[PDB]
Design a protein around this ligand. Structure first.
Ligand code: CB3
Ligand code: CB3
Ligand code: UMP
Ligand code: UMP
Lengths: 316, 316
């Protein structure tokens, strides 16, 4: 069925993959250079062999398309993907006078009262972020995320370039070019960023009547992040298309380093004894047209039947 | 042998390729999303089935790595790839008081004394560019080429970021990351450029002892430009490697729109009856280390045996 691309690249790696040392010191298994494509007419690429949550997926992409770079939207929307990130600027300053959640990362996991205390201090960041307007303002703003990359790229002369918006319109106007590229990689900001864009660039394309998209990813977690990244880029392709009056052709995913962690091998093996069930379907509220106007409810996923969700030891 | 990637993608297109309208109005045949890789241990990827000139290739890449954005280096080096470009800013101004080489493009080809007059006026641009220091200065400077992209990216606060240089050093220092990316796509300059970077981004990678590279190209001419683009990116990989004390693994080429023109189908067919001969070899001056110091002579190509060069009707 549709997710076989995913099972085949997971085969690739734990077989042809050659180990690589790492940033949070649990080795990985890496391949470099890899493409796979999913034809969005057969159905939507979420995985039936592991539960992948389409609610977090959804909230996250929608925050991207508003230009939002503030976790307040994500926290009132039961999304926490990005929490740690901002909680990491909080704990290192003038203000943090509390019980040191410093270096909290693996420290939370295979370590002491970093089940509570850590996980009890987040209530404090996530409450104040939801309430104190003066709080989110500053500590819940996350600076440079996909929002500023996609809709407010920063130029020399102060201005903000909505390069995604410009793009979408470029599409309705000149559907046949090679030039529908949004880059999330800006070199002067790259030097000093905690995570600089992993989803690095993407190209849109009009086929004959169909839209396609191609994502270049430079670094990609096969078990943990990849399932997700597929559904968010296939959502984008449905969303841009409903907007320009189009049919959906394929989403193509090109990889720089796709890599599995040793933390994750017994667990992908487990995925692998399951045999993919039918591909789910997507219905978009047809009344509304204009994707920046869409909201949680306007995007339904029909006929999804998941194999149980495999338990993720993260790395650090 | 090594160039089969190229013959297979040419098969792809004139067979699976679906026509696409175009910018200089001679239709094309297009596929979207495509990867191929060449293992640089078996030899160097120049094509034995068509003459591809390694001198222009060479001069061109070397101009890139000096930060140069001025055709004076290229013209005293028998390279003319980029001429028309600057001759196009010349003919539209204050200064051009001559015999109107206006719109000169297909106008040169299937049209009157645009064999001479056109091709006789270039002597004037290319002479003055070689001599008048005050000429190259201004009209032979080509502004934003791969040189400024690769070694002087333009930031907000005046500064120039040598993102290729930084990269190479990043390599010697942290050989194992996902972060060796050079982007030639800057969104604020993109809006208004005659040709904005086609060779859009590339990722370097250290294998176990070997360097690899991956080029994302957004738009790619299969008969005319692709032969070339392979040899320049495989040269870069040999050059960066000799510098960091490394072995050469692969060059991987990922395509956005790879496309053939109707102008070119009888001619690629012709390529195709030939059967690739042995792959050539590359010797780099081993004394010199530091690629920005290299020069024409320091790069030899041994054992190249070409099939005759097929005559290129360009498009416009
Ligand atoms: C894009 C992307 C994926 N991403 C982003 C992202 C960012 C940095 C990374 N860093 C590393 N080392 N590996 C990754 O896979 C990774 C992924 C994620 C971020 C957090 C969680 C997480 O633990 N929080 C979930 C837990 C629930 C679940 O497991 O279903 C949460 O929402 O609370 C998961 C994925
Ligand atoms: C990168 C790249 C390729 N490029 C750059 C480049 C830029 C714009 C393009 N535009 C279009 N429509 N198609 C292309 O293939 C193309 C290629 C080239 C540029 C000029 C010539 C050319 O006619 N001049 C050669 C002729 C000699 C020969 O045919 O061997 C010369 O050097 O004088 C060839 C390739
Ligand atoms: C990048 C960012 C994101 O949103 N999700 C991801 O999958 N990642 C991953 C990639 C890699 O596993 C790690 C960061 O890579 P690097 O060490 O910085 O090169 O998080
Ligand atoms: C891009 C620039 C270059 O150095 N060499 C190339 O091969 N090209 C090509 C791509 C395409 O054939 C044409 C420009 O594409 P677009 O119409 O601007 O999208 O020249």
């Amino acid at each position: 069925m549709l997710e076989q691309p995913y099972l085949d690249l997971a085969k690739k790696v734990l077989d042809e993959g050659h180990f690589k040392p790492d940033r949070t010191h649990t080795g990985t298994y890496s391949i470099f250079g890899h493409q796979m494509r999913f034809d969005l007419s057969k159905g939507f690429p979420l995985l039936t062999t592991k539960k992948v949550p389409f609610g977090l997926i959804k909230s996250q992409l929608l925050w991207f398309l508003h230009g939002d770079t503030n976790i307040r939207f994500l926290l009132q929307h039961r999304n926490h993907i990005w929490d740690e990130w901002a909680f990491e600027k909080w704990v290192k300053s003038d203000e943090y006078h509390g019980p040191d959640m410093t270096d909290f990362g693996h420290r939370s996991q295979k370590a002491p009262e970093f089940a509570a205390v850590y996980h009890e201090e987040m209530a404090k960041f996530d409450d104040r972020v939801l309430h104190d307007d003066a709080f989110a303002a500053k500590y819940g703003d996350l600076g440079l995320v996909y929002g500023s990359q996609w809709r407010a790229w920063h130029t020399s002369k102060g201005d903000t370039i909505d390069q995604l918006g410009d793009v979408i319109e470029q599409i309705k106007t000149h559907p046949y070019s090679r030039r529908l590229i949004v880059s999330a990689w800006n070199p002067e900001d790259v030097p000093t960023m905690a995570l600089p864009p992993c989803h690095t660039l993407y190209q849109f394309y009009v086929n004959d009547g169909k839209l396609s998209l191609q994502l270049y990813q430079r670094s990609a977690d096969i078990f943990l992040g990849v399932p997700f990244n597929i559904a968010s880029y296939a959502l984008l392709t449905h969303l841009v298309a409903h907007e320009c009056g189009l049919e959906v052709g394929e989403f193509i995913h090109t990889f720089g380093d796709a890599h599995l962690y040793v933390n994750h091998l017994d667990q992908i093996k487990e995925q692998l004894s399951r045999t993919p069930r039918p591909a789910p379907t997507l219905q978009l509220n047809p009344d509304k047209h204009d994707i920046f106007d869409f909201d949680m409810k306007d995007i339904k996923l029909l006929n999804y039947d998941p194999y149980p969700a495999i338990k993720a030891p993260v790395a650090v």
